[PDB]
Amino acid sequence: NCDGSTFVPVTGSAGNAPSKWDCQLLRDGYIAKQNKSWLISGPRIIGTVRTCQFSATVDVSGTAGWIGRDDIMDLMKDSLNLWKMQVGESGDVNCVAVRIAWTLGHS
Amino acid sequence: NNCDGSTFVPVTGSAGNAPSKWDCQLLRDGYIAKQNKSWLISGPRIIGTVRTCQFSATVDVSGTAGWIGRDDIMDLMKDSLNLWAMQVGESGDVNCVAGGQKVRIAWTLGHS
Which residues are in coiled coils (chain B) (predicted)? Predict the structure, then answer.
Protein backbone atom coordinates (compact mmCIF):
# COMPACT_ATOMS: atom_id res chain seq x y z
CA ASN A 1 0.00 0.00 0.00
CA CYS A 2 2.99 2.33 0.68
CA ASP A 3 5.84 2.74 -1.89
CA GLY A 4 8.90 4.93 -2.68
CA SER A 5 9.25 6.15 0.93
CA THR A 6 11.89 8.90 1.47
CA PHE A 7 14.47 8.28 4.26
CA VAL A 8 15.67 11.25 6.42
CA PRO A 9 18.17 10.58 9.26
CA VAL A 10 16.88 12.39 12.41
CA THR A 11 19.63 14.10 14.48
CA GLY A 12 19.45 14.80 18.26
CA SER A 13 21.32 14.85 21.60
CA ALA A 14 23.73 12.05 22.57
CA GLY A 15 21.71 9.81 24.94
CA ASN A 16 18.40 10.13 23.01
CA ALA A 17 18.93 7.31 20.46
CA PRO A 18 16.77 4.17 21.09
CA SER A 19 18.63 0.90 21.79
CA LYS A 20 18.98 -0.88 18.39
CA TRP A 21 18.24 -4.25 20.14
CA ASP A 22 14.80 -2.71 21.17
CA CYS A 23 14.31 -1.64 17.46
CA GLN A 24 15.19 -5.22 16.25
CA LEU A 25 12.60 -6.76 18.69
CA LEU A 26 10.02 -4.09 17.59
CA ARG A 27 10.39 -5.25 13.91
CA ASP A 28 10.73 -9.07 14.38
CA GLY A 29 9.01 -9.73 17.75
CA TYR A 30 6.14 -7.18 17.59
CA ILE A 31 5.40 -5.75 14.05
CA ALA A 32 6.11 -9.10 12.31
CA LYS A 33 3.28 -10.73 14.41
CA GLN A 34 0.66 -8.03 13.61
CA ASN A 35 -1.41 -9.41 10.70
CA LYS A 36 -3.06 -6.01 10.08
CA SER A 37 -2.95 -2.53 8.57
CA TRP A 38 -3.30 0.73 10.58
CA LEU A 39 -5.54 3.67 9.61
CA ILE A 40 -3.49 6.92 10.01
CA SER A 41 -5.49 10.18 10.35
CA GLY A 42 -3.14 11.96 12.77
CA PRO A 43 -0.23 11.26 15.14
CA ARG A 44 -0.46 7.55 16.10
CA ILE A 45 2.07 5.16 17.75
CA ILE A 46 1.95 1.78 15.89
CA GLY A 47 4.25 -0.12 18.28
CA THR A 48 6.77 0.23 21.14
CA VAL A 49 9.50 -2.03 22.55
CA ARG A 50 11.00 -0.23 25.62
CA THR A 51 13.24 2.60 24.16
CA CYS A 52 12.23 2.01 20.45
CA GLN A 53 9.01 3.17 18.75
CA PHE A 54 7.40 3.29 15.31
CA SER A 55 4.85 6.08 14.78
CA ALA A 56 3.08 7.92 11.87
CA THR A 57 0.88 10.89 10.91
CA VAL A 58 -0.69 12.33 7.72
CA ASP A 59 0.97 15.22 5.91
CA VAL A 60 -2.34 16.81 4.64
CA SER A 61 -4.64 17.57 7.60
CA GLY A 62 -8.13 16.01 7.32
CA THR A 63 -6.78 13.00 5.29
CA ALA A 64 -6.52 9.28 6.32
CA GLY A 65 -4.44 6.39 4.88
CA TRP A 66 -3.64 2.68 5.44
CA ILE A 67 -0.08 1.53 6.35
CA GLY A 68 0.50 -2.25 6.61
CA ARG A 69 2.86 -4.20 8.91
CA ASP A 70 4.89 -5.41 5.92
CA ASP A 71 5.45 -1.80 4.76
CA ILE A 72 6.61 -1.08 8.36
CA MET A 73 8.74 -4.30 8.16
CA ASP A 74 10.49 -2.84 5.04
CA LEU A 75 10.74 0.79 6.39
CA MET A 76 12.31 -0.53 9.66
CA LYS A 77 14.78 -2.90 7.84
CA ASP A 78 15.87 -0.05 5.47
CA SER A 79 16.14 2.51 8.37
CA LEU A 80 18.33 0.21 10.58
CA ASN A 81 20.55 -0.56 7.50
CA LEU A 82 20.86 3.26 6.93
CA TRP A 83 22.19 4.16 10.48
CA LYS A 84 25.65 3.75 12.25
CA MET A 85 24.15 11.51 17.02
CA GLN A 86 21.43 9.94 14.80
CA VAL A 87 18.41 9.35 17.15
CA GLY A 88 15.96 8.19 14.46
CA GLU A 89 14.79 7.85 10.84
CA SER A 90 11.74 9.55 9.29
CA GLY A 91 10.16 9.28 5.83
CA ASP A 92 7.26 10.27 3.63
CA VAL A 93 5.37 7.50 1.78
CA ASN A 94 2.18 7.29 -0.40
CA CYS A 95 -0.49 4.84 0.87
CA VAL A 96 -4.07 3.77 -0.12
CA ALA A 97 -6.80 6.17 1.18
CA VAL A 98 -2.44 9.68 0.78
CA ARG A 99 0.94 11.00 2.13
CA ILE A 100 1.96 9.32 5.45
CA ALA A 101 4.93 10.71 7.44
CA TRP A 102 6.47 7.85 9.53
CA THR A 103 9.09 7.95 12.36
CA LEU A 104 11.35 5.27 13.84
CA GLY A 105 12.79 6.68 17.10
CA HIS A 106 12.87 6.89 20.95
CA SER A 107 9.66 5.96 22.89
CA ASN B 1 22.25 31.35 1.61
CA ASN B 2 24.02 28.03 0.79
CA CYS B 3 21.08 25.52 0.62
CA ASP B 4 18.19 25.22 -1.97
CA GLY B 5 14.42 24.84 -1.09
CA SER B 6 14.61 21.57 1.04
CA THR B 7 11.86 19.08 2.12
CA PHE B 8 9.59 18.78 5.22
CA VAL B 9 8.78 15.55 7.20
CA PRO B 10 6.71 15.89 10.41
CA VAL B 11 8.46 13.80 13.13
CA THR B 12 6.06 11.83 15.40
CA GLY B 13 6.82 10.74 18.99
CA SER B 14 5.39 10.22 22.51
CA ALA B 15 3.14 12.87 24.12
CA GLY B 16 5.49 14.91 26.36
CA ASN B 17 8.50 14.82 23.98
CA ALA B 18 7.69 17.95 21.90
CA PRO B 19 9.96 21.00 22.56
CA SER B 20 8.29 24.15 23.92
CA LYS B 21 7.41 26.37 20.91
CA TRP B 22 8.55 29.47 22.92
CA ASP B 23 12.06 27.81 23.19
CA CYS B 24 11.95 27.22 19.34
CA GLN B 25 10.95 30.93 18.73
CA LEU B 26 13.93 32.13 20.91
CA LEU B 27 16.25 29.62 19.10
CA ARG B 28 15.39 31.19 15.67
CA ASP B 29 15.24 34.93 16.61
CA GLY B 30 17.40 35.20 19.78
CA TYR B 31 20.15 32.69 18.90
CA ILE B 32 20.36 31.64 15.16
CA ALA B 33 19.50 35.15 13.88
CA LYS B 34 22.63 36.52 15.68
CA GLN B 35 25.06 33.88 14.29
CA ASN B 36 26.66 35.61 11.26
CA LYS B 37 28.06 32.34 9.83
CA SER B 38 27.70 29.06 7.96
CA TRP B 39 28.35 25.60 9.51
CA LEU B 40 30.33 22.80 7.83
CA ILE B 41 28.35 19.52 8.25
CA SER B 42 30.25 16.19 7.86
CA GLY B 43 28.36 14.30 10.56
CA PRO B 44 25.82 14.75 13.36
CA ARG B 45 26.20 18.35 14.64
CA ILE B 46 23.96 20.45 16.94
CA ILE B 47 23.90 24.02 15.53
CA GLY B 48 21.94 25.62 18.41
CA THR B 49 19.92 24.89 21.59
CA VAL B 50 17.47 26.95 23.68
CA ARG B 51 16.40 24.78 26.69
CA THR B 52 13.92 22.16 25.23
CA CYS B 53 14.39 23.23 21.51
CA GLN B 54 17.31 22.29 19.21
CA PHE B 55 18.38 22.61 15.58
CA SER B 56 20.78 19.91 14.31
CA ALA B 57 22.07 18.38 10.99
CA THR B 58 24.07 15.51 9.44
CA VAL B 59 25.09 14.44 5.90
CA ASP B 60 23.28 11.77 3.92
CA VAL B 61 26.26 9.89 2.39
CA SER B 62 29.03 9.52 5.00
CA GLY B 63 32.42 10.88 3.84
CA THR B 64 30.62 13.96 2.33
CA ALA B 65 30.65 17.52 3.85
CA GLY B 66 28.44 20.58 3.08
CA TRP B 67 27.73 24.18 4.20
CA ILE B 68 24.44 25.23 5.84
CA GLY B 69 24.06 29.02 6.50
CA ARG B 70 22.23 31.10 9.15
CA ASP B 71 19.61 32.15 6.51
CA ASP B 72 18.97 28.50 5.49
CA ILE B 73 18.23 27.65 9.18
CA MET B 74 16.11 30.86 9.64
CA ASP B 75 13.93 29.75 6.66
CA LEU B 76 13.82 25.98 7.60
CA MET B 77 12.76 26.91 11.20
CA LYS B 78 10.08 29.47 10.02
CA ASP B 79 8.64 26.90 7.50
CA SER B 80 8.75 24.04 10.11
CA LEU B 81 6.93 26.09 12.85
CA ASN B 82 4.31 27.19 10.20
CA LEU B 83 3.78 23.50 9.20
CA TRP B 84 3.58 22.38 12.88
CA ALA B 85 1.60 10.16 19.76
CA MET B 86 2.26 13.90 19.16
CA GLN B 87 4.28 15.84 16.56
CA VAL B 88 7.66 16.30 18.33
CA GLY B 89 9.68 17.81 15.45
CA GLU B 90 10.32 18.55 11.76
CA SER B 91 13.08 17.01 9.62
CA GLY B 92 14.14 17.60 6.03
CA ASP B 93 16.65 16.83 3.31
CA VAL B 94 18.25 19.78 1.50
CA ASN B 95 21.03 20.23 -1.13
CA CYS B 96 23.88 22.53 0.01
CA VAL B 97 27.22 23.75 -1.42
CA ALA B 98 29.72 20.94 -0.81
CA GLY B 99 32.37 23.20 0.70
CA GLY B 100 30.38 16.53 -6.14
CA GLN B 101 29.13 20.19 -6.56
CA LYS B 102 26.07 19.73 -4.20
CA VAL B 103 25.77 17.79 -0.87
CA ARG B 104 22.62 16.30 0.78
CA ILE B 105 22.18 17.61 4.39
CA ALA B 106 19.54 16.01 6.67
CA TRP B 107 18.37 18.66 9.23
CA THR B 108 16.20 18.25 12.40
CA LEU B 109 14.24 20.77 14.48
CA GLY B 110 13.24 19.01 17.74
CA HIS B 111 13.73 18.33 21.50
CA SER B 112 17.23 19.00 23.00
Answer: none
